[PDB]
């Protein structure tokens, strides 16, 4: 009747902040490539700023008992309270641990939390403990429970640091209640069907032209427009879009018709949006709002709407299928339908018209994991190198 | 019990004191100077409207911090478990090391003591122990540093000796006058040294081998320890502890370094009193261990050979001991102990050694006198 958190599940660790008497939900985040430290990503401002859950999702590999872990170190399981767990960062493939080196956040005793390549040692392992009197050691862990992770290495709880002006995550002797939200489970997923948080290409027309931004012009200002192109762009990196749902919990569930989502350009990091003048334009994460960056997939151009459909907690039912299914993008608020400008590789512009054209359906093609990782690395490298260049110029 | 206590103490960090709470904390050392300042300040130390009614708050703070340090050091795991590699023991020691930095311990050890002083009237003025910094506070820091961090590096050992241990030794030696010997401070400092510092330097004897660079520090340590041993108010256990410490240090020490100590030995051991027995053992052990240095023309390959001034020292040592034993009334134990020393010195001296017609010009009898040795 009630789901239990088991191994091989993808989740996000959440914490509650009460800065200036404001209840804020935050997630444990880490950009594994490059900066090894862990930071906090806000999810309370999802209506105003998109959370980056791709670097917040973690995978639960193993849930061993304490003595079994001790024996192993000397040499689809369900989690139980008092078991040590290994959390793998989904994007990086690395494991959460205590770095044993502190940035001295006004606490000599506290230790930093980061990612480690090797599973060897007791630093990567964390022991989960109940927060409420209802749960006891040995009990199954409910999906909606508050948990307190304890590092085997330093015996320090995973802590939320209010002391510094910027909220930090560290291993401290004070305990913090962490909430585990189920993103997706790999076993329940259906192969070949669209799921949340998946990198894909939007293939349109007869030549299978893919929606893309202009090629590298050395200007992010010029790389902010959207158009249809065909050829090698379909195998290039600037034609990859990440579909991000507005819901935090079960964000990896099967995408259903009429479900709002945000389309993020992986290489540039900007979210697809509609301007006031009825023109598509990529926008920054700070300015990416629901009002402008919300889009839905619809089976047909029929005027009658799907209406309201209740979100279900779980994998859901697979409706949109890669390749076979034909989809039409409609803005959630304005109701406009994505269409080609029909002006004459092809370099045809993409606008949104309230009727559109009869040939406006596009297919979906899944992107390989290596290609998506490479595009994300390109993003994370170009951002840092642009910052370095601007600093050098200043 | 120690593993449970450490876990509970880190679960509730309030028990560590405001200095070690971790946020806005000045550290153990700065807490010690803050307590010292409170101790000299009359307002905070006293109630400010004879000991059961009056708490000295600064001394109470020092005692609390010393007790916490002592408890944590005693909670530190035994070294045999760490050598065997018990992960729990390693984790406990790492937690304690993170809790207490080594620099704070070194600073607190380097904190100086107030010396009782004689006045015009002839009465020693003595600062009351219930208010101020006391050697028992030092003892806890020493115990923590030994049990948790450990002394395994020659550089760290010599730095510690330079900063914190030698000043206390010299103060104890300077407090060896007849009037100041019976003072509370002298007794407390002697007890602290003989219980904590000297056994530490005795167990860290092998680290004293390669100390050619720091010759002056080792010479000063040896002379100060010897004068402290010559002191009178010492107890039997303290005197034995100093004997063992000096014998352990001198044995591992290189032959060339104790040249300055032999100069004071040759002037005191001919007296053949009760105080000369430890010099007898020291001379016997040294001249038995390092006879190659003196007898062989090449000597030890690494240490080398004598400068002929050490040879003159050994010659007059041998002759003084022999003549003093000849004129001395036969005491069986003293005459049984002196003979090994005499034989070792006789073996060490080359049988073809020239007695130096050019004696050392201006010998230091006047600077180094019979009473007060200076």
XYZ file of N, CA and C in Angstrom, chain B residues 154-285:
396
model
N 62.025 13.958 15.536
C 63.103 14.667 16.216
C 62.925 16.177 16.160
N 62.500 16.714 15.014
C 62.272 18.150 14.897
C 61.188 18.623 15.859
N 60.075 17.892 15.939
C 59.017 18.269 16.869
C 59.481 18.141 18.314
N 60.247 17.091 18.623
C 60.746 16.919 19.984
C 61.650 18.076 20.392
N 62.590 18.456 19.524
C 63.473 19.571 19.838
C 62.733 20.901 19.892
N 61.741 21.114 19.021
C 60.949 22.337 19.100
C 60.184 22.413 20.415
N 59.581 21.298 20.838
C 58.888 21.260 22.122
C 59.842 21.542 23.273
N 61.021 20.915 23.249
C 62.009 21.157 24.295
C 62.404 22.626 24.341
N 62.600 23.238 23.173
C 62.968 24.647 23.111
C 61.862 25.553 23.643
N 60.603 25.265 23.313
C 59.546 26.235 23.591
C 58.988 26.063 25.002
N 58.686 24.831 25.414
C 57.929 24.660 26.639
C 58.602 23.917 27.774
N 59.477 22.962 27.456
C 60.022 22.096 28.497
C 61.257 22.711 29.144
N 62.180 23.231 28.327
C 63.415 23.786 28.881
C 63.171 24.976 29.803
N 62.278 25.946 29.481
C 62.030 27.041 30.434
C 61.601 26.557 31.812
N 60.730 25.545 31.859
C 60.290 25.013 33.146
C 61.436 24.335 33.885
N 62.274 23.590 33.160
C 63.442 22.970 33.776
C 64.369 24.021 34.371
N 64.620 25.100 33.627
C 65.515 26.145 34.112
C 64.914 26.880 35.304
N 63.597 27.099 35.296
C 62.950 27.717 36.450
C 63.058 26.830 37.683
N 62.835 25.523 37.516
C 62.977 24.601 38.637
C 64.405 24.575 39.161
N 65.390 24.586 38.266
C 66.787 24.668 38.672
C 67.111 25.960 39.410
N 66.625 27.105 38.929
C 66.827 28.377 39.605
C 66.114 28.470 40.945
N 65.051 27.689 41.153
C 64.348 27.660 42.431
C 64.937 26.645 43.407
N 66.218 26.304 43.267
C 66.848 25.283 44.094
C 67.635 25.869 45.262
N 67.411 27.136 45.595
C 68.048 27.721 46.764
C 67.452 27.129 48.034
N 68.188 27.270 49.139
C 67.736 26.700 50.405
C 66.421 27.316 50.865
N 66.250 28.625 50.674
C 65.032 29.292 51.121
C 63.840 28.940 50.237
N 64.040 28.908 48.920
C 62.950 28.704 47.973
C 62.681 27.234 47.664
N 63.471 26.309 48.212
C 63.266 24.894 47.916
C 61.956 24.388 48.506
N 61.614 24.843 49.708
C 60.436 24.368 50.420
C 59.159 25.089 50.009
N 59.248 26.054 49.097
C 58.060 26.765 48.647
C 57.129 25.826 47.889
N 55.838 26.166 47.895
C 54.839 25.331 47.237
C 55.100 25.236 45.738
N 55.506 26.350 45.123
C 55.744 26.355 43.684
C 56.882 25.418 43.304
N 57.962 25.413 44.087
C 59.086 24.534 43.785
C 58.669 23.069 43.850
N 57.936 22.694 44.902
C 57.488 21.312 45.038
C 56.545 20.923 43.906
N 55.591 21.799 43.578
C 54.639 21.493 42.517
C 55.336 21.350 41.171
N 56.278 22.248 40.870
C 56.985 22.179 39.598
C 57.867 20.940 39.522
N 58.537 20.589 40.624
C 59.347 19.375 40.635
C 58.483 18.140 40.417
N 57.332 18.077 41.094
C 56.417 16.958 40.900
C 55.942 16.870 39.458
N 55.486 17.990 38.891
C 55.072 18.019 37.494
C 56.169 17.531 36.562
N 57.381 18.067 36.706
C 58.460 17.685 35.805
C 58.751 16.196 35.912
N 58.999 15.712 37.134
C 59.401 14.321 37.318
C 58.279 13.346 36.981
N 57.025 13.802 36.973
C 55.936 12.893 36.638
C 55.585 12.901 35.155
N 55.711 14.041 34.474
C 55.251 14.160 33.097
C 56.383 14.407 32.109
N 57.245 15.394 32.366
C 58.160 15.858 31.327
C 59.348 14.915 31.206
N 59.992 14.615 32.331
C 61.163 13.743 32.310
C 60.848 12.335 31.817
N 59.766 11.671 32.250
C 59.432 10.378 31.632
C 59.160 10.473 30.141
N 58.589 11.584 29.668
C 58.369 11.753 28.235
C 59.692 11.779 27.479
N 60.653 12.558 27.971
C 61.977 12.618 27.369
C 62.755 11.322 27.538
N 62.412 10.513 28.539
C 62.987 9.185 28.698
C 62.451 8.180 27.694
N 61.144 8.193 27.439
C 60.551 7.339 26.421
C 60.855 7.809 25.004
N 61.195 9.086 24.821
C 61.576 9.617 23.518
C 63.093 9.678 23.354
N 63.812 8.815 24.072
C 65.273 8.809 24.002
C 65.819 8.513 22.609
N 65.313 7.527 21.853
C 65.922 7.242 20.541
C 65.886 8.412 19.571
N 64.968 9.364 19.758
C 64.905 10.518 18.867
C 66.070 11.478 19.077
N 66.880 11.266 20.110
C 67.981 12.155 20.454
C 69.278 11.807 19.733
N 69.243 10.872 18.782
C 70.478 10.386 18.174
C 71.109 11.438 17.267
N 70.398 11.843 16.218
C 70.948 12.770 15.247
C 70.663 14.227 15.548
N 71.292 14.765 16.590
C 71.063 16.136 17.033
C 72.332 16.983 16.963
N 73.140 16.781 15.918
C 74.332 17.605 15.737
C 73.969 19.063 15.486
N 72.892 19.304 14.738
C 72.481 20.674 14.449
C 72.091 21.428 15.716
N 71.352 20.784 16.615
C 70.939 21.413 17.872
C 71.827 20.991 19.041
N 73.088 21.429 19.023
C 74.009 21.071 20.098
C 73.724 21.862 21.371
N 73.449 23.162 21.231
C 73.293 24.025 22.399
C 72.074 23.637 23.223
N 70.959 23.324 22.558
C 69.753 22.921 23.273
C 69.982 21.652 24.083
N 70.623 20.645 23.479
C 70.931 19.406 24.188
C 71.894 19.619 25.341
N 72.936 20.428 25.157
C 73.845 20.753 26.249
C 73.151 21.456 27.405
N 72.319 22.458 27.109
C 71.571 23.154 28.146
C 70.614 22.225 28.879
N 69.919 21.350 28.147
C 69.026 20.388 28.785
C 69.790 19.492 29.750
N 70.940 18.972 29.314
C 71.722 18.085 30.167
C 72.230 18.801 31.408
N 72.727 20.032 31.256
C 73.227 20.757 32.421
C 72.106 21.100 33.396
N 70.955 21.541 32.885
C 69.824 21.864 33.744
C 69.291 20.640 34.480
N 69.166 19.504 33.787
C 68.706 18.281 34.440
C 69.697 17.845 35.510
N 70.996 17.953 35.217
C 72.006 17.589 36.203
C 71.925 18.472 37.442
N 71.740 19.782 37.264
C 71.641 20.663 38.426
C 70.358 20.394 39.210
N 69.262 20.098 38.505
C 68.026 19.732 39.189
C 68.215 18.468 40.018
N 68.942 17.488 39.478
C 69.291 16.295 40.240
C 70.162 16.610 41.448
N 71.147 17.495 41.302
C 71.962 17.950 42.421
C 71.146 18.677 43.480
N 69.984 19.224 43.106
C 69.098 19.839 44.076
C 68.777 18.929 45.256
N 68.308 19.547 46.342
C 68.198 18.878 47.636
C 66.773 18.477 48.004
N 65.794 19.362 47.790
C 64.433 19.101 48.253
C 63.759 17.956 47.506
N 64.468 17.312 46.583
C 63.898 16.227 45.796
C 63.595 15.018 46.672
N 62.574 14.264 46.280
C 62.247 12.996 46.915
C 62.990 11.857 46.223
N 62.911 10.671 46.832
C 63.618 9.513 46.292
C 63.104 9.145 44.905
N 61.780 9.125 44.729
C 61.213 8.774 43.430
C 61.590 9.797 42.367
N 61.547 11.085 42.716
C 61.930 12.125 41.765
C 63.398 12.000 41.375
N 64.268 11.743 42.354
C 65.690 11.602 42.062
C 65.949 10.389 41.177
N 65.255 9.278 41.443
C 65.401 8.099 40.593
C 64.898 8.370 39.180
N 63.789 9.102 39.052
C 63.266 9.431 37.729
C 64.259 10.280 36.947
N 64.858 11.275 37.607
C 65.882 12.078 36.948
C 67.099 11.239 36.581
N 67.507 10.316 37.455
C 68.604 9.409 37.140
C 68.321 8.629 35.863
N 67.137 8.020 35.781
C 66.784 7.213 34.614
C 66.731 8.079 33.362
N 66.132 9.269 33.469
C 66.017 10.144 32.306
C 67.388 10.555 31.786
N 68.278 10.979 32.688
C 69.608 11.403 32.266
C 70.397 10.240 31.683
N 70.311 9.061 32.307
C 71.004 7.892 31.782
C 70.490 7.485 30.408
N 69.184 7.590 30.171
C 68.610 7.257 28.872
C 69.023 8.265 27.803
N 69.014 9.557 28.145
C 69.361 10.581 27.161
C 70.842 10.510 26.805
N 71.709 10.409 27.816
C 73.146 10.425 27.562
C 73.588 9.202 26.768
N 72.939 8.057 26.996
C 73.307 6.856 26.263
C 73.087 6.990 24.771
N 71.926 7.522 24.379
C 71.646 7.710 22.959
C 72.371 8.925 22.397
N 72.797 9.847 23.256
C 73.458 11.054 22.779
C 74.854 10.739 22.248
N 75.279 11.524 21.258
C 76.575 11.338 20.628
C 77.704 11.675 21.604
N 78.881 11.067 21.417
C 79.987 11.306 22.364
C 80.430 12.757 22.447
N 80.374 13.495 21.336
C 80.945 14.839 21.310
C 80.111 15.822 22.123
N 78.807 15.566 22.249
C 77.917 16.535 22.879
C 78.148 16.683 24.376
N 78.472 15.603 25.082
C 78.609 15.656 26.529
C 79.971 16.169 26.981
N 80.720 16.825 26.091
C 81.985 17.434 26.489
C 81.774 18.479 27.576
N 80.746 19.315 27.426
C 80.467 20.341 28.423
C 79.985 19.744 29.739
N 79.203 18.664 29.684
C 78.753 18.011 30.909
C 79.900 17.331 31.644
N 80.856 16.756 30.908
C 82.018 16.152 31.555
C 82.816 17.192 32.332
N 82.820 18.440 31.860
C 83.557 19.493 32.552
C 82.990 19.737 33.946
N 81.663 19.707 34.079
C 81.063 19.831 35.401
C 81.171 18.538 36.200
N 81.155 17.385 35.526
C 81.277 16.118 36.245
C 82.645 15.976 36.904
N 83.715 16.345 36.191
C 85.067 16.151 36.716
C 85.301 17.005 37.952
N 84.503 18.054 38.138
C 84.643 18.934 39.289
C 83.809 18.493 40.486
N 82.833 17.606 40.291
C 81.915 17.259 41.370
C 82.043 15.807 41.816
N 82.278 14.883 40.877
C 82.332 13.463 41.239
C 83.536 13.114 42.110
N 84.674 13.833 42.074
C 85.739 13.503 43.037
C 85.338 13.686 44.492
N 84.299 14.475 44.774
C 83.857 14.638 46.155
C 83.399 13.309 46.746
N 82.894 12.407 45.900
C 82.487 11.059 46.304
C 81.476 11.093 47.449
N 80.522 12.012 47.350
C 79.413 12.067 48.287
C 78.263 11.214 47.749
N 77.092 11.313 48.379
C 75.938 10.560 47.903
C 75.453 11.080 46.555
N 75.662 12.370 46.282
C 75.209 12.944 45.021
C 76.049 12.472 43.841
N 77.218 11.884 44.104
C 78.123 11.492 43.029
C 77.785 10.136 42.422
N 76.824 9.404 42.990
C 76.529 8.056 42.509
C 75.966 8.083 41.090
N 75.026 8.991 40.828
C 74.502 9.142 39.472
C 75.578 9.572 38.483
N 76.456 10.537 38.791
C 77.605 10.763 37.901
C 78.460 9.525 37.703
N 78.611 8.688 38.733
C 79.373 7.454 38.569
C 78.724 6.542 37.534
N 77.406 6.338 37.637
C 76.726 5.525 36.627
C 76.847 6.144 35.240
N 76.660 7.462 35.138
C 76.706 8.116 33.833
C 78.079 7.954 33.192
N 79.138 8.212 33.961
C 80.496 8.052 33.463
C 80.802 6.611 33.091
N 80.388 5.645 33.914
C 80.614 4.243 33.585
C 79.958 3.878 32.261
N 78.670 4.201 32.110
C 77.965 3.850 30.882
C 78.586 4.532 29.669
